[PDB]
Design a protein around this ligand. Sequence first.
Ligand SMILES: Nc1ncnc2ccc(-c3cc(F)cc(NC(=O)CN4CCCC4)c3)cc12
Ligand SMILES: [Mg+2]
Lengths: 293, 275
Amino acid sequence: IDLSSLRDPAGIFELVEVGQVYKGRHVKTGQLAAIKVMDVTEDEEEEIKLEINMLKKYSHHRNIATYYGAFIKKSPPGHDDQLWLVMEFCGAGSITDLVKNTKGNTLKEDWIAYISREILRGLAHLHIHHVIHRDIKGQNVLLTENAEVKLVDFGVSAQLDRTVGRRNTFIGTPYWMAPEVIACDENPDATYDYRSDLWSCGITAIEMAEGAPPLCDMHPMRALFLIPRNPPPRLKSKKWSKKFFSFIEGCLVKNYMQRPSTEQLLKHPFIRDQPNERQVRIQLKDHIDRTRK
Amino acid sequence: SSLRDPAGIFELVEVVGNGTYGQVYKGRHVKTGQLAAIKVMDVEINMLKKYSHHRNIATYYGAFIKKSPPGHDDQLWLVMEFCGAGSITDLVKNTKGNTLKEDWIAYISREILRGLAHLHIHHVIHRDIKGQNVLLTENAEVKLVDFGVNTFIGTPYWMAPEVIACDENPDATYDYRSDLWSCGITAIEMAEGAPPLCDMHPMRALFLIPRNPPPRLKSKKWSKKFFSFIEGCLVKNYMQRPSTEQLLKHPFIRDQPNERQVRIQLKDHIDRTRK
Ligand SMILES: Nc1ncnc2ccc(-c3cc(F)cc(NC(=O)CN4CCCC4)c3)cc12
Ligand SMILES: [Mg+2]
């Protein structure tokens, strides 16, 4: 295993069934793995090498779907090669899937507290190693069959899955984007900071509570204009606890300079005080099981 | 509700063209072997139905629903004419020097504009004109794809200034003339191999388009008519931008003496690129 290299995947990883996300396996162990396969030009291969040097290293962590490495499956000369980004497998789907299947498209507050803490613990690990995730959203928060919460990592340190295959030219979905990452009249140069992940975490908590991020009903281009202008988003319903409202307001501080860090939000009462944690963990494991059958 | 299953009628071959369009496949009509493009969506049809009957718009064939087990999300299939010779972005990328001959640009730009004129006369704005949505057939016919147009913002480089919301323009005013700005950027893309601001971060380009003066061709080699055409498409304030009809009369578009040879040169280029 090497994360500073760019070898052919043959004899290391192979694809089993469905850049597109594929189910794959480590040849020698038989361990399942999610593999992102992208078409790369023979010129984009030189861009990968530079981005691989930009990679920051960090250990395994229980809240991060481990990034195993990058590989290039070479095609005949002239023909577009294949970039493979290999990551640990999470079989119970995303948090967006979880909230979508449930009745009323809303999760119980103690489920949001549990999932949000796992997201933050994963983020704390990335931030302490000087890495910004940059794409926190319910789709990138996965569940294992054992109700373990893991952040998608296809080489987040150098954003290997967002910089090649003409993907780099796409703006993407704007709804989880922090105000500072949106270039507007007062912010001409986008400023990605570790705290941009915390804004995304707050939008993910709203998404778990309501089934969709704020401004979901708007055209992405309109939402992109409104995020840096609108006051921080709020939960629509008054049903929620005072701690949950407080948590949202904590993440969603408009000016990133004044937004708390991961450690400070990990101490927030909504995250810190989870009396029914054991039952939540059981309720989630049970929800995953009955959804499978 | 009367949409049938595609089995035995259309089959998916492969993704076209490796993520750039999303879930769009090169399909095949089972009984004839005739190729088709199929837009597969997880489940705006009559838009592609009556507005695609024009030689410069890829023709709509039909709609199908591939039924999944109860509870599991079904698949809508939208089938249209396949354009086998790739996009004009592919064309310029696959040309030596990443630039097309001016008479090729004149020809392709006229076909884009004729497709746009058809859409605009029916009160339809394409909204996503770019080299990647302008396709070639094997016999060098030019066809527009992806009109209508939901949560993903694509590439910003071909977007007109008025379509980008800012302090003075809070509500992005999509107008038929926004497609003409996109056609001018497509002509620059054919001339240089990339749109203006290509070297910038898409988010930075989105900030600069409504602020920057109209883009210009970098080289002085081009004819005065071609410079005039670019200036016509790229008028900053859409209120003074010409209509599709006015640009169709522009000398660069209207006066094409070597049209027959261009068509032959394009057919020949498509063939050499295939092998
Ligand atoms: N006719 C053809 N022949 C050959 N290659 C073709 C390649 C692409 C297409 C095509 C057809 C179509 F309906 C829509 C789109 N584009 C998108 O779906 C983009 N969406 C914007 C919002 C979500 C994604 C592309 C037709 C082809
Ligand atoms: Mg047609």
